[model samples]
Target: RGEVRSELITKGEKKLVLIRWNTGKTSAGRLFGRYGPGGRPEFFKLLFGAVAGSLREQFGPDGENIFNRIRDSEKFRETSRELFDGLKKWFFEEAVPRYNLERGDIFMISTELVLDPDTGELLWNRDKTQLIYWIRSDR
Candidate 1:
């Protein structure tokens, strides 16, 4: 990831802290032989799985699924913020060193969901996909 970006953007009454990464040519090209063209993608997948495991360990049963807990009103922001920091920490400290990857080797993007602060309505992506599908019947 040549450049990493993370920021909180306000969309109407909804506040979202989004994170994204850009894996430039150098990183991917270097990793091509070892991990294939899609190596970076696989790396991201594994990294996210690691994060999920860590969260489960930290939060016990409550962190069974981080996405399901995204409905929290007061902790949503901190959760996303911590997620951003956690991802970076794991990537830089673990992945980078273990895989011999550089800054631009891989990038990441995060998604979050919450109830609208103003109307107390569910927040969906711009494309109208519900953040959590398993609990849809209850709503």
Candidate 2:
């Protein structure tokens, strides 16, 4: 069970908000390969299987057939951008004030820094510092 909570603060009735914070589980399997002694792969595998089963139910036996289709959709870039933007907005608008944090005061916490699957190195599509801030939003 995971949960997310946010709190808001106001100063002298003017809503000089202070902070927001939440706690939840994060899937490391996507960033770190799902294998290691007593690692999380087993749980991820089960979860993936369940999702596959649900998709199969909705799309028929071949419902699982669209895995690549969905993964490689032409709109993937736009979809990803939208997701990132939404997350950024959530962090800035909903989460930050709960903790009275400013942009420069936040830090990212992750088991491992993400890298490019194809390049085997830290992803550099955006500046590393900027990317770190984005990743912190998800945390």
Candidate 3:
């Protein structure tokens, strides 16, 4: 991974922590081999995951499932705009002031940034899915 985007989280300014957002394979205009106009959704989803993950921490344990629990909700599907706006509000309004970091603390971002509420969805790769579903009642 060459540490491609070690700066977006740094901002070139001196900071208490040198951390970066975990956007996988999204460096240099690439997104899961689905780049160009088609990759726009994935690109925005990347940003959404980061900010949303930060908000999830503020929620604690069960609070982490909000996104997946509402995956079919308008905010996640009706239009990707809501995802963008939601994450924007999550970041600037909540995390920034709450964390008190002008540069901010790095939030974990994963494809399943929220809890799956099902085991089939979990890679079990640590924070890959919040709270980690073991037996999964849904399935």
User: Per-residue lDDT for 13-110 in model 1, tens only?
Assistant: 65543333333333333422245345443434432333344335444665555534543445544544454455456545765666555544443333
| Tens digits of lDDT, candidate 2, 16-57 | 111111212332232123452265333323323333443354
Q: In lDDT terms, how accurate is model 1? A: 0.39
- The candidates, ranked best first by TM-score, are 2, 3, 1
> Please, what is the TM-score per model?
0.28, 0.33, 0.30
Q: Which candidate has the top score in lDDT?
A: 1
Q: Where does candidate 2 stray beyond 4 Å? A: 2-24, 27-54, 99-139
Superposition error at 21 for model 1 (Å): 14
**Position 8, candidate 3: lDDT:** 16
lDDT of 3 by residue, 1-139 (tens): 2121211122245211112345443222343224535645355555445434543544446535654564455444433454345444554576456645333123333323322222212111223321111232454
Give lDDT: candidate 2, residue 119.
23
lDDT-superior candidate, 1 or 2: 1
Judge candidate 3 at residue 126 and give its lDDT: 29
- Clash pairs, candidate 1, are 1-104, 1-105, 1-106
| Model 2 Cα shift for residue 7 (angstroms) | 31
